[PDB]
Ligand binder design. Structure first.
Ligand code: CA
Length: 319
C-alpha cells in the first residue's frame, strides 16, 4: 500500500560500528527497509564509516552529505527525510546544519545528543595509557573490524575519533558548534522545539529513546539496574542475542555513573531532541534497530511497526 509513502525519500542513517549491510549480507536496520518499501516508501540506506567523528573533512557528516546528493540526483527529489540511529542522529544533525535546503526532517533514535557515560568511562580507562601503545592496538582491532564488515570495505575507520565523539564533554562542544532549536538547554534534560527553520528551510524534528535499563535499588553509593525488556532470568533474548545481557551490563555501569534510565549506552536525557514521541520503549540500544537479527525481549515493542508508523506520521506532516 502507500501507508509509508512520504513526499521526500527516506534515508536511514546508521550509528557506531555500522554500515548499510554488515559483510554485505546483514542489514543494520534489520527488516526495516523491506517493510517500509512494502508500504510504498522510497527508502535509501547510507553507508558511512562505522568509526569516525561526525564533523571534519573525513568525518561521517560529509560522507552523508555526499550520499544525500546522490539520492537527490537518483530520485529527482529536492529534499530528504533523515532517520538516524544513535550516532547517525548526530550525523543527520550535521547535514541539516550545513545543507539545510536538502533536508525536510530529522528523526533521531537513541541518539547521544549529550554523549554517553559509557564512552566517558572507556575514554577514562584509556587516559591511564602511559605510552599510547595499548590505545593504538585497541583502536586497530576496532578499525579492522570496521573495514572487514563495511559492505564496501570502507577503510576510513578511526575508533579513537569515534570514542571521543561520543563522550559527554565532546558532545557538549558539538552542540555548541552545531546548535539546533530541537535541543533544550544543556543540563536541563528537556527537549527543544518540534521544528526549526534554518537559512529559510524548515525541518520537522523528532526523536525517541529506549529505556529498557531501569535503576532499581540504591544503597551506600551503589545503584542496581534491571532490563525491563525481558522476562526475568529466562527470556529467550538472554540466550539468543548476546547484546541483551551485554547492554544490561553496560547499562548498569551507566546508572552507577549518574545516567538514570538508559538503553545500555545512551541515557533518556541524552536522547531528547525535537518532538519527543516516546522515551518509554522497553528497548536496549540495538533493539531500536531490530537487532540482533530481530531478537528482542518479550516486553519489547516492535521497532519495525514503530518506524513504519513514523513514516506515515511524516507523510501526514507533509514531508
Ligand atoms: Ca535484541
Amino acid at each position: 500500500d502507500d501507508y509509508a509513502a512520504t513526499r521526500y525519500p527516506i534515508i536511514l542513517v546508521h550509528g557506531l560500528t555500522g554500515t548499510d549491510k554488515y559483510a554485505g549480507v546483514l542489514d543494520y536496520f534489520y527488516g526495516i527497509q523491506q517493510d517500509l518499501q512494502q508500504r510504498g516508501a522510497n527508502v535509501y540506506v547510507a553507508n558511512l564509516s562505522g568509526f569516525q567523528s561526525d564533523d571534519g573533512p573525513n568525518g561521517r557528516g560529509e560522507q552523508l552529505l555526499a550520499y544525500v546528493k546522490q539520492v537527490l540526483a537518483q530520485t529527482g527529489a529536492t529534499k530528504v527525510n533523515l532517520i538516524g540511529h544513535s550516532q547517525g542522529g548526530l550525523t543527520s544533525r550535521y547535514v541539516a546544519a550545513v545543507a539545510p535546503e536538502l533536508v525536510a526532517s530529522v528523526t533521531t533514535i537513541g541518539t547521544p545528543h549529550r554523549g554517553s557515560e559509557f564512552a566517558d568511562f572507556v575514554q577514562g580507562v584509556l587516559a591511564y595509557d602511559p605510552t599510547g601503545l595499548s590505545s593504538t592496538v585497541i583502536a586497530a582491532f576496532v578499525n579492522v573490524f570496521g573495514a572487514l564488515t563495511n559492505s564496501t570495505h570502507n577503510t576510513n575507520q578511526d575508533a579513537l575519533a569515534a570514542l571521543q565523539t561520543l563522550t559527554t564533554a565532546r558532545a557538549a562542544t558539538y552542540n555548541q558548534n552545531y546548535p539546533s532549536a530541537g535541543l533544550g538547554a544543556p543540563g536541563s534534560c528537556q527537549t527543544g522545539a518540534p521544528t526549526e527553520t534554518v537559512g529559510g528551510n524548515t525541518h520537522l524534528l523528532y526523536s525517541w529513546a529506549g529505556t529498557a535499563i531501569q535503576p532499581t535499588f540504591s544503597s551506600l553509593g551503589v545503584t542496581g539496574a534491571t532490563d525491563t525488556s525481558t522476562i526475568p532470568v529466562v527470556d529467550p533474548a538472554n540466550a539468543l542475542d548476546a547484546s541483551t545481557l551485554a547492554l544490561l551490563g553496560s547499562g548498569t555501569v551507566m546508572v552507577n555513573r549518574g545516567s538514570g534510565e538508559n538503553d545500555g549506552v545512551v541515557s533518556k536525557c541524552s536522547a531528547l531532541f525535537g518532538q519527543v514521541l516516546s522515551t518509554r520503549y522497553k528497548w536496549n540500544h540495538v533493539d531500536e534497530i531490530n537487532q540482533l537479527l530481530g531478537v528482542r525481549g518479550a516486553y519489547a515493542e516492535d521497532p519495525v511497526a514503530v518506524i513504519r508508523t513514523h513514516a506515515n506520521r511524516l507523510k501526514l506532516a507533509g514531508v
